[PDB]
Amino acid sequence: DNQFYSVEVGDSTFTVLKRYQNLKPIGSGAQGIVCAAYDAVLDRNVAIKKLSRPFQNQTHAKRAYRELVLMKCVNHKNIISLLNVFTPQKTLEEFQDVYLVMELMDANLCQVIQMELDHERMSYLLYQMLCGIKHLHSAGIIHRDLKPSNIVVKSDCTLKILDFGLASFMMTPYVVTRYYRAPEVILGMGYKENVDIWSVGCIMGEMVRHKILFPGRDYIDQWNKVIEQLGTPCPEFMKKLQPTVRNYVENRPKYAGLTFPKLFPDSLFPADSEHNKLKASQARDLLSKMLVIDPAKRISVDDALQHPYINVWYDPAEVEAPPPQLDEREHTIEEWKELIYKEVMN
Ligand SMILES: COc1ccccc1Nc1cc2cnn(-c3csc(C(=O)NC4COC4)c3)c2cc1F
């Protein structure tokens, strides 16, 4: 008679509704554990993420409350949608965990980057990323923390973006990934819409190079790998920095920056036919417009969707979407509990 049952997937206890059967682990981020299962009601396979007590601290509660509201507020083919929310607990006092159900995908973008892709599939994945990004901007949402681990794909090359970005001490052993954050985020300078274009550039470069473009233990090593490859930024970008961080960055050794045919040689691109030779140059051209330190010179999302390497998928009903207030604050763990609990009850 109990409409719930408990399964032990790895070390986490998955207490889900009886409609979800055959639970199997598929992924693991930092906010919860994800499982695949068969939804006996909808007759389809779903992905279930379990958020263990998200009100336990401010970082977990701010992120959980954020993505819980936006996923019923924003819809798109390239932005993941909510299928069902539930908690096995009955009252606010007993409230513990939140389970998010979404349509099951086939792989992470990290698994796809490890593969060798043609120009058709690379351009299509990059087209779907810019479509969902522009819908986020159309809804007044800027990500600033795009990364392959939060992007899922299917075998038919369909792409969807999992999370909604940044708004922070972490009491956890798992470290966050910062290799894809724009220089303005690395140095704290303020941003516009095109801050996510940089993250697209690091991903697109990684699909070609099969190596993290700007690795490092901290922002100290990361900014080094940026200027050692793209070059020391121009003084107009310099003066836009805060005086403290402007001094440190200006005091670094000056680099001319390697050219883009050198950062991405032709041997890394499908270059056997004439059509493949042209697409390799168009791809490298999009890398040149996206991977630039200065945001004022950086290409925008709308201009990237019209780039020759991308606009082969251009379709008006697919690019844009309707545009659908502001709940940013600081609460206690008890206040955060009720705020998240009522969002689950809806
Ligand atoms: C509700 O979820 C969320 C909501 C909000 C933010 C994040 C999430 N997390 C999240 C969602 C999804 C959907 N798909 N995958 C997936 C990766 S790999 C694979 C697979 O191996 N599929 C094979 C087995 O049958 C084909 C399937 C996910 C992995 C995830 F971490």
What CATH number labels 107-321? 1.10.510.10
> Which value, in Å, is the radius of gyration of the alpha carbons in the chain?
21
Query: Mapped to the 3 state alphabet, what secondary structure does 65-85 carry?
Result: HHHHHHCCCCCCCCECCCCEE
195-209 and 274-290 helices, crossing angle to 10°: 140
Q: How far is CA 102 from CA 37, 77, 245, 334, in A?
A: 10, 13, 42, 28
Give yes or no for residue 152 CB within 6 A of ligand 1.
yes
| Residue from 261, 263, 298 nearest 281 by CA | 261
Q: What residue segments make up the domains of the chain, in order of their start? A: 4-106, 107-321
Give the C-alpha separation, 72 to 265, whole Å: 44
What is the helix (H) or strand (E) element at residue 273, kind and residue range? none
Binding residues for ATP are 26-34, 49
Q: Tokens standing for 186?
A: 């690395």
Distance 9 CA to ligand 1 centre (A): 15
Give yes or no for residue 26 CB within 6 A of ligand 1.
yes
From 39, 60, 106, give the residue whose CB has the most ligand 1 atoms within 8 Å, as the site to mutate.
106
End-to-end, the C-alpha distance of the chain in Å comes to: 24
Instruction: Calculate the CA 58 to chain-centre distance.
Output: 21
Query: Do 240 and 204 contact (CB within 8 A), yes or no?
Result: no
User: Is there a shared CATH topology between the 4-106 domain and the 107-321 domain?
Assistant: no
| Residue from 294, 261, 127, 117 nearest 200 by CA | 127
From 49, 83, 109, give the residue whose CB has the most ligand 1 atoms within 8 Å, as the site to mutate.
49
> What's phi and psi for 294, nearest 5 deg?
-75, 125
Enter the DSSP assignment of 328.
-
Give the C-alpha separation, 111 to 100, whole Å: 23
Q: Tokens standing for 131?
A: 């479509």
Give the C-alpha separation, 30 to 256, whole Å: 38
| Rounded to 5°, angle at Cα 199 from 194 and 205 | 125
Quickly count: other Cβ atoms within 10 Å of residue 36's Cβ: 18
* 3-state SS, residue 95: coil
Give yes or no for residue 85 CB within 6 A of ligand 1.
no
Distance 135 CA to ligand 1 centre (A): 21
Q: How far is CA 1 from CA 5, 66, 333, in A?
A: 10, 34, 33
Query: Do 212 and 206 contact (CB within 8 A), yes or no?
Result: yes
Give yes or no for residue 22 CB within 6 A of ligand 1.
no
Residue at token pair 């100290």:
220
Rounded to the nearest 10 degrees, how much is the dihedral formed by the CA atoms of 187, 193, 194, 197? 100
Query: Do 35 and 9 contact (CB within 8 A), yes or no?
Result: yes
Give yes or no for residue 36 CB within 6 A of ligand 1.
yes
Determine the residue type at 134. Answer: K
What residue owns the CA closest to ligand 1's atom 5? 162
| Residue from 257, 201, 206, 198 nearest 227 by CA | 257
Give the C-alpha separation, 224 to 129, whole Å: 27
Q: What is the DSSP string of 157-186?
A: --EEE----------SSSPP--TT--HHHH
* 3-state SS, residue 8: strand
Quickly count: other Cβ atoms within 10 Å of residue 115's Cβ: 10
Give the C-alpha separation, 279 to 270, whole Å: 9
Residues written for the chain: 346
What CATH number labels 4-106? 3.30.200.20
Q: What is the DSSP string of 11-56?
A: TEEEEEETTEEEEEEEEE-SS-EEEEEEETTTTEEEEEEEEE-GGG
Distance 230 CA to ligand 1 centre (A): 34
